[PDB]
Amino acid sequence: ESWAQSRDEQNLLQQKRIWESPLLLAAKENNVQALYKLLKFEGCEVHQKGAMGETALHIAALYDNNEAAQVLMEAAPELVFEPMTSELYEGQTALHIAVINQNVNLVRALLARGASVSARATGSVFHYRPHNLIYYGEHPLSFAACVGSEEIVRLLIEHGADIRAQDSLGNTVLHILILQPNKTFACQMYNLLLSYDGGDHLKSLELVPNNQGLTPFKLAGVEGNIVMFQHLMQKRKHIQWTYGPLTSTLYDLTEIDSSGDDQSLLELIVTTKKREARQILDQTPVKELVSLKWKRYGRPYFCVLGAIYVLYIICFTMCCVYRPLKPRITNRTNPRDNTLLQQKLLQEAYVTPKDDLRLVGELVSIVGAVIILLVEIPDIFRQTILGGPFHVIIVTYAFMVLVTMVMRLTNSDGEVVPMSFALVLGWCNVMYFARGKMIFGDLMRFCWQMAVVILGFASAFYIIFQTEDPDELGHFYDYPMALFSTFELFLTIIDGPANYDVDLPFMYSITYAAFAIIATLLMLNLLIAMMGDTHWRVAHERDELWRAQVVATTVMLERKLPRCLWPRSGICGREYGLGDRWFLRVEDRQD
Amino acid sequence: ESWAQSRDEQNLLQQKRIWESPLLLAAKENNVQALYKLLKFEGCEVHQKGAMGETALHIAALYDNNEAAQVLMEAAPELVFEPMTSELYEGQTALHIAVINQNVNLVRALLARGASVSARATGSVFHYRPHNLIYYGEHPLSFAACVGSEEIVRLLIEHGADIRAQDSLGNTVLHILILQPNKTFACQMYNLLLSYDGGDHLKSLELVPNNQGLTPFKLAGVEGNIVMFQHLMQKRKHIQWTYGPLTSTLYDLTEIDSSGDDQSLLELIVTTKKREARQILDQTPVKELVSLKWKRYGRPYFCVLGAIYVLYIICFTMCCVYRPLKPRITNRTNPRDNTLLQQKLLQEAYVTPKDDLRLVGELVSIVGAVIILLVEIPDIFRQTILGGPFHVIIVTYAFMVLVTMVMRLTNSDGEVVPMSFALVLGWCNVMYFARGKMIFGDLMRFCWQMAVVILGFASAFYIIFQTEDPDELGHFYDYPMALFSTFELFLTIIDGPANYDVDLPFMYSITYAAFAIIATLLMLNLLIAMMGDTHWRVAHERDELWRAQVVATTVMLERKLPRCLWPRSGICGREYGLGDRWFLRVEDRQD
Numbered sequence A, B: 001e002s003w004a005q006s007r008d009e010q011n012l013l014q015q016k017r018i019w020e021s022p023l024l025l026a027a028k029e030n031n032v033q034a035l036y037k038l039l040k041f042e043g044c045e046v047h048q049k050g051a052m053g054e055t056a057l058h059i060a061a062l063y064d065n066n067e068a069a070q071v072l073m074e075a076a077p078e079l080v081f082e083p084m085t086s087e088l089y090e091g092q093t094a095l096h097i098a099v100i101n102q103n104v105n106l107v108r109a110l111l112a113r114g115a116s117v118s119a120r121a122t123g124s125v126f127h128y129r130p131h132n133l134i135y136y137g138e139h140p141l142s143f144a145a146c147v148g149s150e151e152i153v154r155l156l157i158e159h160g161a162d163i164r165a166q167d168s169l170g171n172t173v174l175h176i177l178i179l180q181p182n183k184t185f186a187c188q189m190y191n192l193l194l195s196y197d198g199g200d201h202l203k204s205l206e207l208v209p210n211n212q213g214l215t216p217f218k219l220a221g222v223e224g225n226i227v228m229f230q231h232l233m234q235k236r237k238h239i240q241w242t243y244g245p246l247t248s249t250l251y252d253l254t255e256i257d258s259s260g261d262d263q264s265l266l267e268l269i270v271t272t273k274k275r276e277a278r279q280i281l282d283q284t285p286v287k288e289l290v291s292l293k294w295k296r297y298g299r300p301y302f303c304v305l306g307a308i309y310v311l312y313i314i315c316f317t318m319c320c321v322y323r324p325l326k327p328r329i330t331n332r333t334n335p336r337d338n339t340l341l342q343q344k345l346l347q348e349a350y351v352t353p354k355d356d357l358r359l360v361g362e363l364v365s366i367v368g369a370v371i372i373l374l375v376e377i378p379d380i381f382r383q384t385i386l387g388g389p390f391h392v393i394i395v396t397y398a399f400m401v402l403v404t405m406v407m408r409l410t411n412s413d414g415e416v417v418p419m420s421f422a423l424v425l426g427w428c429n430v431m432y433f434a435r436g437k438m439i440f441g442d443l444m445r446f447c448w449q450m451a452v453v454i455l456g457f458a459s460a461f462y463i464i465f466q467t468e469d470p471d472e473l474g475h476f477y478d479y480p481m482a483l484f485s486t487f488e489l490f491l492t493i494i495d496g497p498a499n500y501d502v503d504l505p506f507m508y509s510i511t512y513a514a515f516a517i518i519a520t521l522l523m524l525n526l527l528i529a530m531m532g533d534t535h536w537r538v539a540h541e542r543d544e545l546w547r548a549q550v551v552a553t554t555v556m557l558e559r560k561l562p563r564c565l566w567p568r569s570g571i572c573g574r575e576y577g578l579g580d581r582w583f584l585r586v587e588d589r590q591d
């Protein structure tokens, strides 16, 4: 406690040793006469290491002091090779400091001496950490590329600077240029480094991946660099023809799509916590890509799978609305007069008349729950909500159905507690399917969301009071009136089921508490959709997020669906003779 | 699945055959030496049809390759006449491709050869479909007019380009210019094509109608082209005099008004789904036209017809508030104790004392319903809500009155279900009559809408519980308290009629559900009118729509009203000697 306090002390301790060491002070003050009155008479320790393990030349390189540095190099040419022996700057040479300060005469003189163009500055200051204001890499060639000094860049290549060099994070000089603030100027420097590549199709510098398996083009999309992305897109697009205003350009569509497997631009954009990366799926090679995946295949399968989940949940309630008998049997109704339980457990089953109709319905609710677990549980092993918490709810729903199964086969009294949780988890997970005029567009999402919530809480409130006596607190004595009570409940017109002389079950005081919060948030999410659609162009901000939600869902539907359905995007390039990648044909009009 | 996938494959398949065919490749690459080393030794198939049924000249015309095209024309002058034999480009000649690319030297050379200036490019790419980025027509003259190349336009007329030419959609060159994005530049090209007209008053190019019966001037209004509309308005306005800043201009007002019959700019603007066309009724010849139609004749007749409909509905409730007797008679009141019915049916009528007063009232409710059907049902045969859903409700209201008549004459128990629907349909259709300070202006619409809704639901809730016992659930035991209960109901102050030990009729659980939604939307439409009037100039957006609603209603009132009322707009031009059209006198001041 802490680390920044140390370097703040060391930077003060550095200026303290510079103040003290006259050789280091004269190197800072550029006192030429004081350096000759020190190096020639009387011979002072010229290999003097300062507070940061720096030589007198390092100090002479920090402060642009060419006259003082040239004196230190002619009286002791060995100081050029000495790196910073400190921990904060372990590996930095006098060439690194001269390159960043863009001191061309000092760089030309250090290269004339013979300075190492491959020295890795592995100091803790040079790390890619949020507490370091700059991240340029380790090699001096990487420093020149980031300061925008094209003169030093080629001057280092002339002395044998390996552009293929990677730092401790496996980043080439191309990766580091994309992580820079000046995006519009780094595009110019990016093309300068590519010219010095081997010129061969194999072992390309643009193909050398990051240590996290990211080519520079791929890293531009994950980091949300629009300027570098559009620039890198030029190298991978081909214009077929120009018919007046139309321009039928053909995009490469290789590193932008599965598979893979985890390697694909789309999966990396929807799963990253970087908001800025959202904008990448709106670029002119990518926005055409997800819009076609959602028009065909995407939207129909989401509604086909949607209607299946609607039937699978209405069947679960069909077995809940007609749950198992019987009357109380027990005389316990006389003691503890606050109780209202006409408790109903089994079995006492089969017995079959109309009970096999619900047994096959209960069997569907079980085989569907494990199928839900058979497609989700093997997926958590390989987690970002963008995207909706549909997956978090779909696994806890099948968890409650299995618990209700284990609740059964034991004749437990608390049947109702796990079974009522699956009612809201089953329906409210339906409203996620609303992904399938903006005031009217967001209003229809409320009408969907609202009708979905009441069909999950009225079914719940029915079960909560299907056992309990309806003469007192009879808001839900049958299904058509449990729906109507809950509907009125949703708008606070009814005072809500309230009774204090009677002991209502533990689940009402819990389920109604959650119904009171969701009913207000949906009524609060409605006002923001009524005003936030008209008050400003924020409706665009209220819009892409949904669009990104649709894109996140479209990538989701492509992972588990087999290959016979959902054909690959684009057109393959084997016979016709483009190999072997799949290309997207895009034509655009200009005005 | 799909069609765009095919052309994406064919464009890739085209570049595949170009890659393969050396004659087609050299035509694309503009390889002059390779074309002579192919056409002279050894004689290759020069009539080579590519993937899109294109000749080597077509490829030489796609990519501006004049040197390569001139070689193909001197070695085989027959390639000029060959059109694209494919399905996507059926009819396109090498002249079409040269005109769009604005290759004047190639167009001058193709016309020197003798190219057809009347070749219709009937290919599927050239269709007016949303999946085609451009729509220029079929004839090469129409292509030049859309690219803005006035040099090619007159160069085609010099070689006999028929400006009277129509494509498959019956569109002249004037119609296609209005459907173009560059509106401010198409005005210049529009005047160039009109100069080459026959110069005769009859058979004018501006009068040649679309296949959908639309002159170019009329099409500009339907499509919402403001720049072309104001430009076309210059040709049909006459300035009478200039008295300083005043300019008394006289507008033609011919194709802007009925009749007709369906042919009129106003009816085409209010019935189209094109939002952009709304702006046309705000132009300086049209905005003066509907404002005079609404000031006189318009506003009074809407309130005269308004007060008539107010009396016709209050009479319907006057017969409902005093509906037919009698007591229950039946002992069924002891079994099914949940029931509260003191059911009342007839007849048991006449009997007449004060019952003839309601019989003539019931007779008015019948003759008025058929009259409503006599003015609406013959109108559906000849449907856009702009405009209000007043017509959809006014026909279903008279439907419920006729059903209640058929409900009667059979002594059916369910009298109440069709009769209660006509109460809300009758009143809530009144609030449409609110069409007759912006915060205060939209607030008075709420006070109208609110008082109209409660007078339709309190009358309904009264009927719902006029039969049922008032000792339990007695919110509506008489009319003055049914109104006061419902009024309090409208603001959720009262917990709403709630009872669970008693079986309330089927209509309360339905009518009160609709009362709970409309009462919140009117309270939500109020907040948007309180904030959306001040937060931005969106109040203009909240305003024209109402203005367009008033204009849509004004056109509605002019269709069924006879000719003796509502005189024609403007002044006729027969004696005085302007013939025979009706003109509007408009004077404007400038600063």
Ligand SMILES: C[C@@H]1NC(=O)N[C@@H]1CCCCCC(=O)O
Residues within 6 Å of the ligand: A052, A054, A058, A059, A062, A089, A125, A126, A127, A132, A133, A134
């Ligand atoms: C100024 C210090 N004195 C010195 O000789 N090297 C240091 C250079 C500081 C660079 C800090 C870059 C970073 O924040 O990581």
Ligand SMILES: C[C@@H]1NC(=O)N[C@@H]1CCCCCC(=O)O
Residues within 6 Å of the ligand: A241, A242, A243, A246, A248, B052, B054, B058, B059, B062, B089, B125, B126, B127, B132, B133, B134
């Ligand atoms: C490029 C294609 N090659 C060719 O010879 N004709 C085509 C011209 C394309 C025009 C497409 C206009 C449209 O979208 O309809």
Ligand SMILES: [Ca+2]
Residues within 6 Å of the ligand: A492, B492
């Ligand atoms: Ca309240």
Ligand SMILES: [Ca+2]
Residues within 6 Å of the ligand: A494, A495, B494, B495
């Ligand atoms: Ca209350």
